Amino acid sequence: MISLADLQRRIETGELSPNAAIAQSHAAIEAREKEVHAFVRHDKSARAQASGPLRGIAVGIKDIIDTANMPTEMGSEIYRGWQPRSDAPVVMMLKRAGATIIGKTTTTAFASRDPTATLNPHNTGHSPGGSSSGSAAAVGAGMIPLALGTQTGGCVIRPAAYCGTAAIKPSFRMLPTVGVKCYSWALDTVGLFGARAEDLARGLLAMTGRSEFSGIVPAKAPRIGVVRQEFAGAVEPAAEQGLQAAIKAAERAGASVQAIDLPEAVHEAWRIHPIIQDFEAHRALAWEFSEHHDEIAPMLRASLDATVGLTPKEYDEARRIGRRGRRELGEVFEGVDVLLTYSAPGTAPAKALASTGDPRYNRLWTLMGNPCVNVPVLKVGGLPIGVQVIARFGNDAHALATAWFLEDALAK
Amino acid sequence: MISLADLQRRIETGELSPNAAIAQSHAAIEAREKEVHAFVRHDKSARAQASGPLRGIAVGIKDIIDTANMPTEMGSEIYRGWQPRSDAPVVMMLKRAGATIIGKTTTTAFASRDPTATLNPHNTGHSPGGSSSGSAAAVGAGMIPLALGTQTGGCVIRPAAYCGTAAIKPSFRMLPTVGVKCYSWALDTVGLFGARAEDLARGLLAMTGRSEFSGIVPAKAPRIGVVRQEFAGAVEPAAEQGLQAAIKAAERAGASVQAIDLPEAVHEAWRIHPIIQDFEAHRALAWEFSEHHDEIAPMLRASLDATVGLTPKEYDEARRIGRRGRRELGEVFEGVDVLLTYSAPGTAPAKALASTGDPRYNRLWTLMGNPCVNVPVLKVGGLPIGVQVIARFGNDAHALATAWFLEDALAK
């Protein structure tokens, strides 16, 4: 994989030229697209910009995020050839920083369950996860140093884990979702894919100008609270193997690790995530469902069909539960700096299963809103397994710092 | 003005057919549009639907709200001829209920300060307010029974007051802002314009299906708390005359009215509203500011040029201040059912002043999120004056019930 931070340092010293960096990405893409299929469209004419911390940095954009110079097809036939008039605010954050928008990465139809043609870089016979399939794959295949995606259930953390890349779903609403095809406005959150935690930090710094992302360094003696999300059901062996490897590494590195069971209020929040998501999706995708029903991809069409009956009453109740959940989760962070858990059920599923993976270990955090970061840990049978670092809402910096600490710990 | 509730009842009993109702509207628009100029686009072929609670109900849509069959120009040359692919979820809420989208109403450029060409229905020499200029003017001129607008500062309540129509800015986020051109995502709130409070209730019931909007009837002897928002300075004589008249009518109607002070935390929230608004505006309108700077309407261009330096730091600090204001405001509603205040600084400004009016008496409430309803009180020099009824967050139904109470009280 290509490191954003690496590129930055070398370009800043003149050791590497922006044009060369971009030519390298174009090369990497051409070198494996026929194998991975992570791009809906690749702008081969894309060139590096003259100034900015992200000059010479090629970025892939999930195709539900608006671009003014390239179509935004939402991974749906309904939007084939659709051309937005403007670039989404998050795209502008990158462009204003000097980044090069190299192309649109594949997305499942409307960021839901329907698999794209994209394949896992680590094993062509496996899924790269979803819904940010192309962003995770492209970064995992070393095609680009950065990619944008979104998370409603576990659309960022899960595919990142499956593809062995670092990634972060910042605190809810930190990055605007303006110009981002909505699935559930209570959940939709923009995320970033990179090679390492440090790459994510430098990316967020350039996009937001927030001092909190400046000068981040690996955390020291982090206080970690391990949660296995029992309420999420039975995890697969590989996932647990990765979590134990992470715990062992952190302990040896000086971290204090303790197991903790999450409050009933949190278990409940996890249960009602589907209610909030699906009730809102019917509103958010009303036009598509009412006017182009049969054109909606199979799996998404099915989930919408099964949920037309969700009522405002139960929706309100679900949101009440969500709030109770957030309140009691905050108390959990009184004794620990971060929480550590699974990023996915296990290794990436074989493409034959026609599944981008179950988001059961991701969805709770998207609703709570806390910053989540995936940390590659190991590989079982050649397929990546990662762990998920979670900090208190609004403390994305500490989440990245601990993720960094963890990466260094695993490196022994 | 045309009453949606009235049309509903007559259509329900069969006294009026949906086709006739819609023909009524087309005729009403035809009758005054040449003098008011409230529509960017009037779809003369718009027909009535055969079923639904809103069948036969014509609705005007502020032009920053996406429509699939009509252009959405954002009141800016930058979006001349722009055609969204899909109808915004709120538009679909109306369509699914059986309503007719009769046209797009005027909006100031990107819903900011730059005046549209629309004129006040009560005196064409005056402003109809903004930024939901056309929606307020159309309803006020008796063209349509319902219209959608948005409020970031006071874009719903102020123009409603100026044009003498009933209107409501529901609780923050009750209605989705998907497909609604964003100015400030922390503030933007969809609102409705109608003849009376009952019309708003029926409109919200059909759009949301929420039982809270079903069976609403005038409130009885409400506990009203009068707040003059001294932090925003003294209001113009006409506005105070309308407030005094509303208090007296309410009292003689059996309501308990007490002048109350607003917590310092709330005063502070009003103060930092511009910080949140303008900082986000720079991110939400990034593409426009970067690629079409000189094409942005003059006033908005100037406000943006003067706020480029706002920092994430002061922004976060403003948000913290706003959250504290919301908390303490709720406390105020523990002893009072609704707050009663000004809807605008006074009567509508002369067009010659090139101003849609000062939003100072509206902005706080948009940030707090509470449901606000405008109640027409009287007219000074032929120009309408209204009062603003505010309930606790999530108590939209009560705001409407008390507004209805106030309307009857004023009618004695």
GROMACS .gro file of N, CA, C and O in nm, chain A residues 68 78-79 82-87 89 92 95-96 173 176 178 181-182 185 208-210 212 282-284 286-287 289-292 312 315-316 319, chain B residues 68 78-79 82-87 89 92-93 95-96 172-173 176 178 182 185-186 208-210 282-284 286-287 289-292 312 316 319:
model
  288
   68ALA      N    1  -1.802   1.712  -0.991
   68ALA     CA    2  -1.847   1.796  -1.102
   68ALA      C    3  -1.788   1.760  -1.238
   68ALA      O    4  -1.850   1.787  -1.341
   78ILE      N    5  -3.010   0.328  -1.221
   78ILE     CA    6  -3.100   0.441  -1.216
   78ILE      C    7  -3.026   0.573  -1.237
   78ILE      O    8  -3.083   0.669  -1.288
   79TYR      N    9  -2.899   0.576  -1.199
   79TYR     CA   10  -2.820   0.696  -1.214
   79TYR      C   11  -2.708   0.683  -1.317
   79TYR      O   12  -2.608   0.755  -1.310
   82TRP      N   13  -2.538   0.992  -1.476
   82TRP     CA   14  -2.573   1.110  -1.396
   82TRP      C   15  -2.453   1.199  -1.368
   82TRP      O   16  -2.350   1.152  -1.319
   83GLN      N   17  -2.466   1.328  -1.397
   83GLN     CA   18  -2.357   1.421  -1.376
   83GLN      C   19  -2.392   1.537  -1.283
   83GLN      O   20  -2.463   1.629  -1.323
   84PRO      N   21  -2.341   1.534  -1.159
   84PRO     CA   22  -2.369   1.643  -1.064
   84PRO      C   23  -2.308   1.774  -1.114
   84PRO      O   24  -2.205   1.774  -1.181
   85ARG      N   25  -2.373   1.885  -1.081
   85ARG     CA   26  -2.326   2.015  -1.122
   85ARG      C   27  -2.204   2.056  -1.039
   85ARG      O   28  -2.113   2.121  -1.089
   86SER      N   29  -2.202   2.014  -0.913
   86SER     CA   30  -2.093   2.051  -0.822
   86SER      C   31  -2.020   1.937  -0.752
   86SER      O   32  -2.066   1.823  -0.751
   87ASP      N   33  -1.905   1.970  -0.694
   87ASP     CA   34  -1.827   1.874  -0.618
   87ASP      C   35  -1.882   1.882  -0.477
   87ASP      O   36  -1.911   1.991  -0.428
   89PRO      N   37  -1.894   1.896  -0.077
   89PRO     CA   38  -1.802   1.968   0.011
   89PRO      C   39  -1.678   1.889   0.053
   89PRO      O   40  -1.569   1.946   0.063
   92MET      N   41  -1.430   1.905  -0.218
   92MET     CA   42  -1.368   2.036  -0.223
   92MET      C   43  -1.261   2.049  -0.115
   92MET      O   44  -1.159   2.113  -0.136
   95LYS      N   45  -0.967   1.893  -0.276
   95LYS     CA   46  -0.918   1.974  -0.387
   95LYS      C   47  -0.855   2.105  -0.339
   95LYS      O   48  -0.754   2.149  -0.395
   96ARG      N   49  -0.913   2.167  -0.238
   96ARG     CA   50  -0.859   2.292  -0.185
   96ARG      C   51  -0.723   2.267  -0.120
   96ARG      O   52  -0.639   2.357  -0.112
  173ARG      N   53  -2.109   1.359   1.183
  173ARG     CA   54  -2.126   1.497   1.138
  173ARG      C   55  -2.001   1.585   1.136
  173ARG      O   56  -2.012   1.705   1.110
  176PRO      N   57  -1.900   1.703   0.646
  176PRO     CA   58  -2.035   1.717   0.589
  176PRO      C   59  -2.075   1.606   0.493
  176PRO      O   60  -1.992   1.554   0.418
  178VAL      N   61  -2.311   1.667   0.279
  178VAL     CA   62  -2.373   1.742   0.171
  178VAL      C   63  -2.312   1.683   0.043
  178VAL      O   64  -2.191   1.660   0.036
  181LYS      N   65  -2.495   1.085  -0.140
  181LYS     CA   66  -2.623   1.014  -0.150
  181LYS      C   67  -2.663   0.959  -0.014
  181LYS      O   68  -2.593   0.875   0.043
  182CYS      N   69  -2.776   1.005   0.038
  182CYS     CA   70  -2.823   0.963   0.169
  182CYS      C   71  -2.894   0.829   0.174
  182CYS      O   72  -2.973   0.794   0.086
  185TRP      N   73  -2.996   0.958   0.724
  185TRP     CA   74  -2.933   1.081   0.771
  185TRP      C   75  -2.891   1.079   0.918
  185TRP      O   76  -2.812   1.162   0.961
  208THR      N   77  -0.969   1.929   0.698
  208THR     CA   78  -1.037   2.013   0.796
  208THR      C   79  -0.961   2.129   0.857
  208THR      O   80  -1.022   2.224   0.906
  209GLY      N   81  -0.828   2.122   0.857
  209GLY     CA   82  -0.749   2.229   0.916
  209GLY      C   83  -0.763   2.230   1.068
  209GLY      O   84  -0.727   2.328   1.134
  210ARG      N   85  -0.814   2.121   1.123
  210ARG     CA   86  -0.833   2.110   1.267
  210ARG      C   87  -0.701   2.077   1.337
  210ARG      O   88  -0.638   1.976   1.309
  212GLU      N   89  -0.634   1.955   1.611
  212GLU     CA   90  -0.633   1.825   1.678
  212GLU      C   91  -0.566   1.717   1.594
  212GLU      O   92  -0.514   1.619   1.648
  282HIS      N   93  -3.641   0.461   0.372
  282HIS     CA   94  -3.763   0.470   0.293
  282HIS      C   95  -3.794   0.614   0.256
  282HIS      O   96  -3.847   0.641   0.148
  283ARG      N   97  -3.760   0.707   0.345
  283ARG     CA   98  -3.781   0.850   0.318
  283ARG      C   99  -3.673   0.900   0.224
  283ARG      O  100  -3.702   0.967   0.125
  284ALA      N  101  -3.548   0.867   0.256
  284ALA     CA  102  -3.432   0.911   0.179
  284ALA      C  103  -3.431   0.859   0.036
  284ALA      O  104  -3.380   0.926  -0.054
  286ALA      N  105  -3.720   0.763  -0.123
  286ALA     CA  106  -3.861   0.763  -0.163
  286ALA      C  107  -3.881   0.771  -0.314
  286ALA      O  108  -3.958   0.693  -0.371
  287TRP      N  109  -3.812   0.863  -0.379
  287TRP     CA  110  -3.825   0.879  -0.523
  287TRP      C  111  -3.789   0.750  -0.596
  287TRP      O  112  -3.865   0.703  -0.681
  289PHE      N  113  -3.773   0.436  -0.480
  289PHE     CA  114  -3.864   0.329  -0.443
  289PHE      C  115  -4.003   0.344  -0.507
  289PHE      O  116  -4.065   0.245  -0.546
  290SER      N  117  -4.050   0.467  -0.519
  290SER     CA  118  -4.181   0.494  -0.578
  290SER      C  119  -4.185   0.498  -0.730
  290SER      O  120  -4.280   0.450  -0.791
  291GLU      N  121  -4.081   0.553  -0.792
  291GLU     CA  122  -4.077   0.568  -0.937
  291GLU      C  123  -3.991   0.468  -1.015
  291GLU      O  124  -4.009   0.451  -1.136
  292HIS      N  125  -3.897   0.404  -0.947
  292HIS     CA  126  -3.808   0.310  -1.013
  292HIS      C  127  -3.783   0.187  -0.929
  292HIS      O  128  -3.672   0.134  -0.925
  312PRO      N  129  -4.364   0.570   1.231
  312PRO     CA  130  -4.296   0.684   1.295
  312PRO      C  131  -4.285   0.660   1.446
  312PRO      O  132  -4.188   0.700   1.510
  315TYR      N  133  -4.011   0.427   1.523
  315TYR     CA  134  -3.891   0.496   1.480
  315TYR      C  135  -3.850   0.592   1.592
  315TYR      O  136  -3.734   0.599   1.630
  316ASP      N  137  -3.947   0.665   1.646
  316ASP     CA  138  -3.919   0.757   1.754
  316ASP      C  139  -3.867   0.682   1.875
  316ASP      O  140  -3.773   0.727   1.942
  319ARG      N  141  -3.510   0.587   1.828
  319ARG     CA  142  -3.421   0.699   1.848
  319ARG      C  143  -3.405   0.731   1.997
  319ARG      O  144  -3.299   0.776   2.040
  480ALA      N  145  -3.779   1.644  -0.960
  480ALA     CA  146  -3.732   1.567  -1.074
  480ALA      C  147  -3.790   1.610  -1.209
  480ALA      O  148  -3.728   1.588  -1.313
  490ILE      N  149  -2.576   3.051  -1.134
  490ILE     CA  150  -2.482   2.940  -1.134
  490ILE      C  151  -2.557   2.809  -1.161
  490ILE      O  152  -2.501   2.715  -1.217
  491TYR      N  153  -2.684   2.804  -1.121
  491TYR     CA  154  -2.765   2.684  -1.142
  491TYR      C  155  -2.877   2.702  -1.245
  491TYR      O  156  -2.978   2.631  -1.243
  494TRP      N  157  -3.047   2.402  -1.407
  494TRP     CA  158  -3.009   2.280  -1.335
  494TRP      C  159  -3.130   2.190  -1.311
  494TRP      O  160  -3.232   2.234  -1.259
  495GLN      N  161  -3.117   2.063  -1.347
  495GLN     CA  162  -3.225   1.968  -1.330
  495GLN      C  163  -3.187   1.848  -1.244
  495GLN      O  164  -3.112   1.760  -1.288
  496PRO      N  165  -3.236   1.844  -1.119
  496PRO     CA  166  -3.206   1.732  -1.029
  496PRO      C  167  -3.262   1.602  -1.086
  496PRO      O  168  -3.361   1.603  -1.158
  497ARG      N  169  -3.197   1.490  -1.055
  497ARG     CA  170  -3.242   1.361  -1.103
  497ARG      C  171  -3.364   1.312  -1.026
  497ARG      O  172  -3.456   1.254  -1.083
  498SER      N  173  -3.366   1.339  -0.896
  498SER     CA  174  -3.474   1.294  -0.810
  498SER      C  175  -3.548   1.403  -0.733
  498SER      O  176  -3.498   1.515  -0.716
  499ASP      N  177  -3.668   1.369  -0.688
  499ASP     CA  178  -3.749   1.460  -0.608
  499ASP      C  179  -3.693   1.447  -0.466
  499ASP      O  180  -3.659   1.338  -0.423
  501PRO      N  181  -3.681   1.404  -0.069
  501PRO     CA  182  -3.771   1.326   0.016
  501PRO      C  183  -3.896   1.402   0.064
  501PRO      O  184  -4.005   1.346   0.065
  504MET      N  185  -4.143   1.406  -0.207
  504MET     CA  186  -4.202   1.275  -0.220
  504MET      C  187  -4.306   1.251  -0.109
  504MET      O  188  -4.404   1.180  -0.130
  505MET      N  189  -4.284   1.310   0.009
  505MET     CA  190  -4.379   1.295   0.119
  505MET      C  191  -4.513   1.354   0.074
  505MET      O  192  -4.620   1.299   0.101
  507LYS      N  193  -4.611   1.409  -0.252
  507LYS     CA  194  -4.662   1.331  -0.363
  507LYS      C  195  -4.725   1.199  -0.318
  507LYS      O  196  -4.830   1.160  -0.368
  508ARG      N  197  -4.661   1.131  -0.223
  508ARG     CA  198  -4.714   1.005  -0.175
  508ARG      C  199  -4.848   1.022  -0.105
  508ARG      O  200  -4.928   0.929  -0.098
  584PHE      N  201  -3.618   2.065   1.466
  584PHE     CA  202  -3.501   2.036   1.386
  584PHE      C  203  -3.494   1.888   1.347
  584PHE      O  204  -3.510   1.799   1.431
  585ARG      N  205  -3.471   1.865   1.218
  585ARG     CA  206  -3.458   1.731   1.162
  585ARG      C  207  -3.582   1.641   1.158
  585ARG      O  208  -3.571   1.525   1.120
  588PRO      N  209  -3.661   1.560   0.669
  588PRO     CA  210  -3.528   1.546   0.611
  588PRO      C  211  -3.488   1.660   0.519
  588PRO      O  212  -3.571   1.717   0.448
  590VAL      N  213  -3.257   1.617   0.292
  590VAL     CA  214  -3.196   1.552   0.178
  590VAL      C  215  -3.257   1.619   0.055
  590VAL      O  216  -3.378   1.638   0.049
  594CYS      N  217  -2.794   2.287   0.084
  594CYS     CA  218  -2.743   2.322   0.214
  594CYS      C  219  -2.668   2.454   0.227
  594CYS      O  220  -2.586   2.490   0.142
  597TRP      N  221  -2.574   2.295   0.774
  597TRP     CA  222  -2.637   2.169   0.811
  597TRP      C  223  -2.677   2.162   0.958
  597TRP      O  224  -2.759   2.079   0.997
  598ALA      N  225  -2.619   2.249   1.039
  598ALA     CA  226  -2.652   2.250   1.180
  598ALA      C  227  -2.780   2.330   1.201
  598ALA      O  228  -2.845   2.317   1.306
  620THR      N  229  -4.594   1.325   0.718
  620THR     CA  230  -4.524   1.236   0.811
  620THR      C  231  -4.599   1.114   0.862
  620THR      O  232  -4.536   1.013   0.898
  621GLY      N  233  -4.731   1.122   0.870
  621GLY     CA  234  -4.809   1.010   0.920
  621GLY      C  235  -4.798   1.000   1.072
  621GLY      O  236  -4.834   0.898   1.131
  622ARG      N  237  -4.747   1.105   1.135
  622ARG     CA  238  -4.732   1.107   1.280
  622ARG      C  239  -4.865   1.133   1.350
  622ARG      O  240  -4.933   1.231   1.321
  694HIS      N  241  -1.922   2.818   0.439
  694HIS     CA  242  -1.801   2.810   0.361
  694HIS      C  243  -1.770   2.667   0.316
  694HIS      O  244  -1.710   2.647   0.211
  695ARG      N  245  -1.810   2.568   0.395
  695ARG     CA  246  -1.784   2.430   0.356
  695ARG      C  247  -1.894   2.383   0.260
  695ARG      O  248  -1.865   2.318   0.160
  696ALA      N  249  -2.019   2.416   0.292
  696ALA     CA  250  -2.134   2.374   0.212
  696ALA      C  251  -2.140   2.436   0.073
  696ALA      O  252  -2.199   2.378  -0.019
  698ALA      N  253  -1.853   2.539  -0.085
  698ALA     CA  254  -1.713   2.541  -0.128
  698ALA      C  255  -1.694   2.546  -0.279
  698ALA      O  256  -1.618   2.629  -0.329
  699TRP      N  257  -1.762   2.458  -0.351
  699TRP     CA  258  -1.750   2.455  -0.496
  699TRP      C  259  -1.788   2.592  -0.556
  699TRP      O  260  -1.715   2.647  -0.638
  701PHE      N  261  -1.798   2.892  -0.409
  701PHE     CA  262  -1.703   2.995  -0.369
  701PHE      C  263  -1.569   2.985  -0.443
  701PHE      O  264  -1.509   3.087  -0.476
  702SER      N  265  -1.524   2.862  -0.469
  702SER     CA  266  -1.397   2.838  -0.537
  702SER      C  267  -1.400   2.847  -0.689
  702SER      O  268  -1.308   2.902  -0.749
  703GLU      N  269  -1.504   2.792  -0.750
  703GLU     CA  270  -1.512   2.789  -0.896
  703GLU      C  271  -1.602   2.894  -0.960
  703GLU      O  272  -1.592   2.918  -1.081
  704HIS      N  273  -1.688   2.958  -0.882
  704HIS     CA  274  -1.780   3.056  -0.937
  704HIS      C  275  -1.800   3.174  -0.844
  704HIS      O  276  -1.911   3.226  -0.831
  724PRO      N  277  -1.194   2.648   1.282
  724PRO     CA  278  -1.261   2.530   1.335
  724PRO      C  279  -1.272   2.547   1.487
  724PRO      O  280  -1.369   2.504   1.549
  728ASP      N  281  -1.609   2.517   1.689
  728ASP     CA  282  -1.637   2.418   1.792
  728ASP      C  283  -1.684   2.486   1.919
  728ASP      O  284  -1.775   2.438   1.986
  731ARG      N  285  -2.044   2.585   1.880
  731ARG     CA  286  -2.132   2.469   1.889
  731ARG      C  287  -2.155   2.428   2.034
  731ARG      O  288  -2.265   2.390   2.072
   0.00000   0.00000   0.00000
